[PDB]
Motif scaffolding. Structure first.
Motif, PDB file in Angstrom:
ATOM      1  N   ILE A   1      -0.355  -7.341  -6.431  1.00  0.00           N
ATOM      2  CA  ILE A   1      -1.401  -8.005  -5.652  1.00  0.00           C
ATOM      3  C   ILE A   1      -1.497  -9.475  -6.097  1.00  0.00           C
TER       4      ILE A   1
ATOM      5  N   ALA B   1       0.841  -1.195   0.000  1.00  0.00           N
ATOM      6  CA  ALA B   1       0.000   0.000   0.000  1.00  0.00           C
ATOM      7  C   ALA B   1       0.873   1.240   0.000  1.00  0.00           C
TER       8      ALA B   1
ATOM      9  N   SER C   1      -7.183  -3.892  -4.251  1.00  0.00           N
ATOM     10  CA  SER C   1      -5.966  -3.070  -4.050  1.00  0.00           C
ATOM     11  C   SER C   1      -5.384  -3.433  -2.688  1.00  0.00           C
ATOM     12  N   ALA C   2      -4.115  -3.092  -2.443  1.00  0.00           N
ATOM     13  CA  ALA C   2      -3.493  -3.420  -1.161  1.00  0.00           C
ATOM     14  C   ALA C   2      -4.283  -2.752  -0.032  1.00  0.00           C
ATOM     15  N   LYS C   3      -4.711  -1.512  -0.276  1.00  0.00           N
ATOM     16  CA  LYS C   3      -5.478  -0.744   0.711  1.00  0.00           C
ATOM     17  C   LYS C   3      -6.788  -1.422   1.099  1.00  0.00           C
TER      18      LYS C   3
ATOM     19  N   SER D   1       0.350  -2.439 -13.949  1.00  0.00           N
ATOM     20  CA  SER D   1      -0.255  -1.631 -12.912  1.00  0.00           C
ATOM     21  C   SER D   1       0.031  -2.268 -11.548  1.00  0.00           C
ATOM     22  N   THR D   2      -0.356  -1.551 -10.490  1.00  0.00           N
ATOM     23  CA  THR D   2      -0.172  -2.004  -9.133  1.00  0.00           C
ATOM     24  C   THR D   2      -0.783  -3.390  -8.925  1.00  0.00           C
ATOM     25  N   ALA D   3      -1.769  -3.739  -9.750  1.00  0.00           N
ATOM     26  CA  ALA D   3      -2.443  -5.039  -9.675  1.00  0.00           C
ATOM     27  C   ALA D   3      -1.509  -6.232  -9.838  1.00  0.00           C
TER      28      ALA D   3
ATOM     29  N   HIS E   1       2.646   1.609  -3.513  1.00  0.00           N
ATOM     30  CA  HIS E   1       1.662   1.949  -4.532  1.00  0.00           C
ATOM     31  C   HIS E   1       1.111   3.362  -4.380  1.00  0.00           C
ATOM     32  N   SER E   2       0.974   3.832  -3.139  1.00  0.00           N
ATOM     33  CA  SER E   2       0.475   5.180  -2.915  1.00  0.00           C
ATOM     34  C   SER E   2       1.540   6.191  -3.365  1.00  0.00           C
TER      35      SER E   2
ATOM     36  N   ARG F   1      -9.272  -6.656  -9.586  1.00  0.00           N
ATOM     37  CA  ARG F   1      -8.390  -7.185  -8.542  1.00  0.00           C
ATOM     38  C   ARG F   1      -8.346  -6.202  -7.360  1.00  0.00           C
TER      39      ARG F   1
ATOM     40  N   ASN G   1      -8.287  -4.582 -13.236  1.00  0.00           N
ATOM     41  CA  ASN G   1      -9.159  -3.524 -12.740  1.00  0.00           C
ATOM     42  C   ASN G   1     -10.111  -3.980 -11.649  1.00  0.00           C
TER      43      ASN G   1
END
Length: 294
Positions: A182, A112, A272-274, A177-179, A115-116, A270, A268
């Motif tokens: 994950i 998180a 998010s870590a958050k 992407s961040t995905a 990625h942030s 999936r 899209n």
């Protein structure tokens, strides 16, 4: 190197050999990674340099970046063990659920944070998850992927592991992407639970088909746009999805639910870590200490 006291090899990374070293002056024990040059790209230097500011309890600290004689060395905080070794060590009894849940929870916080800050790992695997005696677990090598480039065939032809690669990467999507992180962590979560890699592919296509065989061959219903991906082939066999209860037994429904959202085909869709940190699965999370034999 004369700045360090007898450095000793401790492994081979994607980019180069990793050493454990003690700074002659500070006395500090650190990890030293030599990056494998055409004079080393200036573009890479500034990008790697920026990572020096990424500080988080669950991110292995990048202490220094040393550029000399077409050579690039990365100095990192040192941790005695990685999750791959720990899992092999815990092979007989398995890692207790509370410890698996603590590790997953910490890894998601680390993800998180990164990625942030618009930093992606892209190559997560048990080997770059380091642990200590305090029950902490940290992500190593964040941002190096985009900083440099995608693996291919190192000087040592070290076989690049594909087991944790997201499907959009395997299907040729150029914009990661961040995905993708994950997805990798979901694969790792499953592995800690079952004590066996979830998708141990031996080639890119075998990796893709192992995923298809378990989660079902994706189609336009579950993943809009998948049939137009660069490497998609209408000839891919159509496998039906298996039951998750058969995927990671005997994980409880909270755990199976979280893993399913971490393994959604559509990047899209999936989780998010958050959002994952707020999943009911972590309602009773704690921080047990592992028994490490150093």
């Amino acid at each position: 190197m004369e700045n360090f006291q007898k450095v000793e090899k401790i492994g081979e990374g994607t980019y180069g050999v990793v050493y454990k070293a003690r700074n002659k002056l500070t006395g500090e024990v650190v990890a030293l990674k030599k990056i494998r040059t055409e004079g080393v790209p200036s573009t890479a230097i500034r990008e790697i340099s920026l990572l020096k500011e990424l500080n988080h309890p669950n991110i292995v600290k990048l202490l220094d970046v040393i550029h000399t004689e077409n050579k690039l060395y990365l100095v990192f905080e040192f941790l005695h063990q990685d999750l791959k070794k720990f899992m092999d060590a815990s092979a007989l009894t398995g890692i207790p659920l509370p410890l698996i849940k603590s590790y997953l929870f910490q890894l998601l916080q680390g993800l998180a944070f990164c990625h942030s800050h618009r930093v992606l790992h892209r190559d997560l695997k048990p080997q770059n998850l380091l642990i200590n005696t305090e029950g902490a677990i940290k992500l190593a090598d964040f941002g190096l992927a985009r900083a440099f480039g995608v693996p291919v065939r190192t000087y040592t032809h070290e076989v690049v592991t594909l087991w944790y690669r997201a499907p959009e990467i395997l299907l040729g999507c150029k914009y990661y992407s961040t995905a993708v992180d994950i997805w990798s962590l979901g694969c790792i979560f499953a592995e800690m639970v079952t004590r066996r890699a979830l998708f141990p592919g031996d080639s890119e296509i075998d990796q893709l088909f192992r995923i298809f065989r378990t989660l079902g061959t994706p189609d336009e219903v579950v993943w809009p746009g998948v049939t137009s991906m660069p490497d998609y082939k209408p000839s891919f066999p159509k496998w039906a999805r298996q039951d998750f209860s058969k995927v990671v037994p005997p994980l409880d429904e909270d755990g199976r639910s979280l893993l399913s959202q971490m393994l959604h085909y559509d990047p899209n869709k999936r989780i998010s870590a958050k959002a994952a940190l707020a999943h009911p699965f972590f309602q009773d999370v704690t921080k047990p200490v592992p028994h490490l034999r150093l």
